[PDB]
Design an enzyme around this catalytic site. Sequence first.
Site, PDB file in Angstrom:
ATOM      1  N   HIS A  18     -13.765  40.198  10.812  1.00 17.74           N
ATOM      2  CA  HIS A  18     -12.837  39.268  11.475  1.00 17.74           C
ATOM      3  C   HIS A  18     -11.384  39.467  11.046  1.00 17.74           C
ATOM      4  O   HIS A  18     -10.496  38.879  11.666  1.00 17.74           O
ATOM      5  CB  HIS A  18     -13.277  37.794  11.307  1.00 17.74           C
ATOM      6  CG  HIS A  18     -13.017  37.215   9.951  1.00 17.74           C
ATOM      7  ND1 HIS A  18     -13.979  37.189   8.967  1.00 17.74           N
ATOM      8  CD2 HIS A  18     -11.929  36.598   9.428  1.00 17.74           C
ATOM      9  CE1 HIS A  18     -13.480  36.606   7.884  1.00 17.74           C
ATOM     10  NE2 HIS A  18     -12.242  36.250   8.132  1.00 17.74           N
ATOM     11  N   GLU A  30      -1.238  45.438  -6.460  1.00 18.16           N
ATOM     12  CA  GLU A  30      -0.498  44.212  -6.418  1.00 18.16           C
ATOM     13  C   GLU A  30      -1.095  43.118  -7.260  1.00 18.16           C
ATOM     14  O   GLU A  30      -2.291  42.968  -7.300  1.00 18.16           O
ATOM     15  CB  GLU A  30      -0.564  43.640  -4.978  1.00 18.16           C
ATOM     16  CG  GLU A  30       0.462  44.146  -4.016  1.00 18.16           C
ATOM     17  CD  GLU A  30       0.200  43.671  -2.605  1.00 18.16           C
ATOM     18  OE1 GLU A  30      -0.968  43.511  -2.286  1.00 18.16           O
ATOM     19  OE2 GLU A  30       1.147  43.510  -1.828  1.00 18.16           O
ATOM     20  N   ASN A  62       1.392  40.167  -8.012  1.00 21.08           N
ATOM     21  CA  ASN A  62       2.300  39.307  -7.278  1.00 21.08           C
ATOM     22  C   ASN A  62       2.473  39.914  -5.879  1.00 21.08           C
ATOM     23  O   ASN A  62       3.063  40.987  -5.739  1.00 21.08           O
ATOM     24  CB  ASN A  62       3.634  39.204  -8.020  1.00 21.08           C
ATOM     25  CG  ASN A  62       4.535  38.103  -7.469  1.00 21.08           C
ATOM     26  OD1 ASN A  62       4.680  37.935  -6.257  1.00 21.08           O
ATOM     27  ND2 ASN A  62       5.137  37.335  -8.364  1.00 21.08           N
ATOM     28  N   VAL A  80       6.501  40.269  -4.445  1.00 22.51           N
ATOM     29  CA  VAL A  80       7.531  41.112  -5.058  1.00 22.51           C
ATOM     30  C   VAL A  80       7.056  42.554  -5.195  1.00 22.51           C
ATOM     31  O   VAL A  80       5.863  42.808  -5.379  1.00 22.51           O
ATOM     32  CB  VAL A  80       7.986  40.571  -6.436  1.00 22.51           C
ATOM     33  CG1 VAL A  80       8.497  39.138  -6.304  1.00 22.51           C
ATOM     34  CG2 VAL A  80       6.874  40.672  -7.478  1.00 22.51           C
ATOM     35  N   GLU A 111       2.726  49.170  -7.144  1.00 21.32           N
ATOM     36  CA  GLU A 111       2.106  49.152  -5.817  1.00 21.32           C
ATOM     37  C   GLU A 111       1.926  50.530  -5.181  1.00 21.32           C
ATOM     38  O   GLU A 111       2.674  51.467  -5.455  1.00 21.32           O
ATOM     39  CB  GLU A 111       2.894  48.302  -4.821  1.00 21.32           C
ATOM     40  CG  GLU A 111       2.658  46.800  -4.913  1.00 21.32           C
ATOM     41  CD  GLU A 111       3.581  46.114  -5.891  1.00 21.32           C
ATOM     42  OE1 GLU A 111       4.789  46.446  -5.904  1.00 21.32           O
ATOM     43  OE2 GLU A 111       3.106  45.227  -6.626  1.00 21.32           O
ATOM     44  N   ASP A 146     -20.339  40.521   9.339  1.00 23.22           N
ATOM     45  CA  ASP A 146     -18.889  40.399   9.115  1.00 23.22           C
ATOM     46  C   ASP A 146     -18.425  41.369   7.993  1.00 23.22           C
ATOM     47  O   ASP A 146     -18.138  40.971   6.856  1.00 23.22           O
ATOM     48  CB  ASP A 146     -18.520  38.935   8.807  1.00 23.22           C
ATOM     49  CG  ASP A 146     -17.022  38.670   8.819  1.00 23.22           C
ATOM     50  OD1 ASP A 146     -16.247  39.542   9.254  1.00 23.22           O
ATOM     51  OD2 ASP A 146     -16.621  37.560   8.388  1.00 23.22           O
ATOM     52  N   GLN A 154      -8.851  29.670   2.871  1.00 28.22           N
ATOM     53  CA  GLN A 154      -8.082  30.449   3.849  1.00 28.22           C
ATOM     54  C   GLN A 154      -7.051  31.369   3.169  1.00 28.22           C
ATOM     55  O   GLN A 154      -6.248  30.915   2.342  1.00 28.22           O
ATOM     56  CB  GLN A 154      -7.417  29.519   4.874  1.00 28.22           C
ATOM     57  CG  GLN A 154      -8.309  29.132   6.042  1.00 28.22           C
ATOM     58  CD  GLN A 154      -9.487  28.248   5.682  1.00 28.22           C
ATOM     59  OE1 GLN A 154      -9.368  27.301   4.885  1.00 28.22           O
ATOM     60  NE2 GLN A 154     -10.647  28.551   6.273  1.00 28.22           N
ATOM     61  N   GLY A 155      -7.042  32.632   3.593  1.00 28.06           N
ATOM     62  CA  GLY A 155      -6.248  33.717   3.014  1.00 28.06           C
ATOM     63  C   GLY A 155      -7.052  34.586   2.040  1.00 28.06           C
ATOM     64  O   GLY A 155      -6.602  35.666   1.656  1.00 28.06           O
ATOM     65  N   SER A 205     -10.243  35.599   2.858  1.00 25.99           N
ATOM     66  CA  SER A 205     -11.133  36.425   3.699  1.00 25.99           C
ATOM     67  C   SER A 205     -11.039  37.909   3.484  1.00 25.99           C
ATOM     68  O   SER A 205      -9.952  38.439   3.389  1.00 25.99           O
ATOM     69  CB  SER A 205     -10.853  36.217   5.207  1.00 25.99           C
ATOM     70  OG  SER A 205     -11.588  35.118   5.667  1.00 25.99           O
ATOM     71  N   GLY A 206     -12.179  38.581   3.452  1.00 20.24           N
ATOM     72  CA  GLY A 206     -12.239  40.013   3.308  1.00 20.24           C
ATOM     73  C   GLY A 206     -12.267  40.473   1.844  1.00 20.24           C
ATOM     74  O   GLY A 206     -12.656  41.618   1.579  1.00 20.24           O
TER      75      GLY A 206
END
Lengths: 163, 223
Positions: B40, B52, B54, B57, B62, B84, B174-175, B177-178
């Site tokens: 999804h 990452e 943070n 920033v 990264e 899923d 929420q956020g 996911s995955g």
Amino acid sequence: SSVVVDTNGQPVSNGADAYYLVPVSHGHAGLALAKIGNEAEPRAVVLDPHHRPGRPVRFESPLRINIIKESYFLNIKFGPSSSDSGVWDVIQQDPIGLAVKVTDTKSLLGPFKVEKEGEGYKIVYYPERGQTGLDIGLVHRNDKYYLAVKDGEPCVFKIRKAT
Amino acid sequence: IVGGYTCGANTVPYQVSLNSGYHFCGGSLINSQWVVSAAHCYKSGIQVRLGEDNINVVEGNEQFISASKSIVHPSYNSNTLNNDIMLIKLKSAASLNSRVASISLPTSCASAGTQCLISGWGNTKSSGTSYPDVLKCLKAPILSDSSCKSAYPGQITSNMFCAGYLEGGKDSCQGDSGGPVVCSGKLQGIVSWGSGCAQKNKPGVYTKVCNYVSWIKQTIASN
């Protein structure tokens, strides 16, 4: 599949923010509640000329993602996010027909999708998840526009973040 | 993540963020060139961000690597939430370091009561919203399939499991996911769904990765 977007070009949030649904063809009318049958309290969702920009809505999916896509089944509600009141549903009721109403329960997966249409979005209602959808349109009665199933004749909205 | 703690820089090196100008999902690095996430979370032109802690920033550790292939499971059903899972092939190998390492796939399924580490940059509140700058972590046990089915009647398939606390207060949200659910050092789950976050008798539901290992291995082998 596409992300639903607000009038400022930002992805619509999953419950976190409230949005006005601004009709493109009835600009001077906003979401409100009205009485349907012999009911004491106003429980029908309408677009009302004497109610602008109207009550804002939240779009909610159980998926743990912070944006809404056109393919997600949604609850749509007035009021606060984690509540179970102001939850939209579709109920057969004269004289309107398959009328959009508010209730005080909220299923895991709501029956609505938000789908691109013309210059904005339409609300589509699914009697069951595996099936084709039914457009939400308007039934003009008592100087207001009752939201109801009107397949082929959707009410097109822009989604404006309440701020 | 609700009721969790700050992971710290090096602690979850297999966590990645799925990005399209904004962070929208978590994922797990399973080798130098492949990420697993939720179906999804599929989006065109995904960039994977690795190293990452943070998210807001540019720390310098990264790596931002574009997806070259995003393969949703062929049985993913957007009506039932079943299957899923998505694989992302990265366009180049990630360079591995203290903040970037792969998580291995399980050889068998995990049991009820096994403690897992769940992580992400999702909402930290059960009512309202607050998004953290740094990666958050939560220890949460796998729940039995029977109690998962009792929690969510008619909606739990063989490819999902519940984890967390039927008491509430501690959950993904929420956020997240995955993102990864790691038990006994192996990727056992992917953050998928639930009713609210950290609510009583509404635990998190996670994609059961042990059912997909042969599909993942075959998909990687052929792509």
